[PDB]
């Protein structure tokens, strides 16, 4: 019922999470930004080359234990 | 995403137009689409990450081995500083056709501005950096539009097998981009 995931930052920093596969990734994203003291709206999360949406769940994305999510700050120019 | 008339483009605007372009190319010229990569600007930055595993993950996502052409939007956003989110966009086209002489053409509407990042990305894609001509910007907010319209013009030229990829004659249209994003 549970899945362990790592969030990997652009500088290589890693944070580990354990969550239910039926739960929205919003909870992991909210917790990562909260813990990193960054605005949720300034961060994008990527998995398998695609931007993740907060409303998607791990089961929806076929995530398996040990999967990594890459967190990147948004860019402007 | 919403884009204003003089708003600086964010990665979300670039990525959305690249998504539309990829689907357009898949429908009109699937053989060129299969050999071309429109790299998400965030993934392009991952490719220059100081973290080797981040850069390698991004490389796998791009799968450059089976590609003849890579289009990379180049942001100058910081990898290590949360407040420096970028000032400028440029375009790197990697031509991998001669699998022994890979060339990375760097189109920058402010000539020279992003050359250091372009060189780092070209090296990480095993390619030699070549500055390539593009019409120079005459305002401080349209660099992202040059990147997107430059990409679209280059794709047309590649599909047509045109030899000259000089973009000094490029015509930009922010309005047409805003139309595409709003559709």
* List of domains in chain B: 11-182 (3.40.395.10)
Find out whether B69 and B36 touch, Cβ atoms under 8 Å. Answer: yes
Q: Tell me whether residues A11 and B11 touch, CB distance under 8 A.
A: no
Find out whether B128 and B101 touch, Cβ atoms under 8 Å. Answer: yes
Header resolution in angstroms? 1.5
Q: In what order do the strands lie in the sheet with A50-51?
A: A14-20, A2-9, A67-73, A43-47, A50-51
Q: Tell me whether residues B57 and A10 touch, CB distance under 8 A.
A: no
Q: Which residues of B53-82 are buried (b: 16+ CB within 10 A; e: fewer)?
A: ebbebbbebbebeebbbbbbbbbbbbbeee
The structural domains of chain A, ordered by start, are 2-73 (3.10.20.90)
Residue of B114, B105, B118, B113 whose CA lies nearest to B164: B105
**A54 and chain B: CB distance < 8 Å anywhere?**
no
Residue of B145, B137, B81 whose CA lies nearest to B113: B137
Residue of A75, A61, A63 whose CA lies nearest to A6: A63
Residue of B73, B33, B170, B158 whose CA lies nearest to A77: B73
What whole-number distance in Å separates Cα of residue A17 and Cα of residue A6? Answer: 6
Q: Which of B10, B42, B50 sits opposite A46 (nearest CB)?
A: B42
Could you give the C-alpha distances from B18 to B9, B81, B89, in angstroms and in order?
13, 26, 14
What whole-number distance in Å separates Cα of residue B82 and Cα of residue A11? Answer: 11
Measure B163 CA to nearest chain A CA, in Å: 30
């Amino acid at each position: 019922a549970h899945i362990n995931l790592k969030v990997k930052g652009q500088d290589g920093n890693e944070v580990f999470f354990r969550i239910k596969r039926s739960t929205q990734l919003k909870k992991l994203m909210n917790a990562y930004c909260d813990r990193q003291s960054v605005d949720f709206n300034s961060i994008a999360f990527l998995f398998d080359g695609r931007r993740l949406r907060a409303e998607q769940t791990p089961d929806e994305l076929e995530m398996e234990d040990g999967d990594e999510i890459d967190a990147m700050l948004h860019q402007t120019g | 995403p919403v884009l204003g008339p003089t708003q600086w483009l964010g990665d979300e605007h670039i990525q959305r137009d690249y998504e539309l372009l990829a689907q357009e190319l898949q429908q009109n010229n699937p053989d060129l689409a299969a050999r071309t990569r429109f790299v998400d600007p965030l993934i392009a930055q991952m490719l220059r990450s100081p973290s080797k595993e981040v850069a390698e993950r991004a490389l796998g996502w791009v799968r450059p081995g089976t590609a003849d052409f890579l289009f990379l939007p180049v942001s100058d956003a910081s990898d290590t500083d949360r407040h420096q989110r970028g000032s400028h966009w440029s375009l790197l086209l990697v031509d991998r056709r001669d699998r022994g002489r890979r060339v990375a053409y760097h189109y920058d509407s402010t000539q020279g501005y992003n050359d250091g990042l372009a060189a780092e990305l070209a090296g990480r894609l095993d390619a030699n950096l070549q500055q390539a001509p593009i019409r120079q910007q005459q305002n401080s907010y349209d660099c992202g539009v040059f990147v997107l319209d430059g990409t679209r013009e280059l794709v047309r030229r590649l599909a047509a097998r045109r030899p000259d990829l000089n973009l000094n004659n490029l015509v930009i249209s922010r309005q047409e981009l805003r139309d595409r994003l709003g559709a």
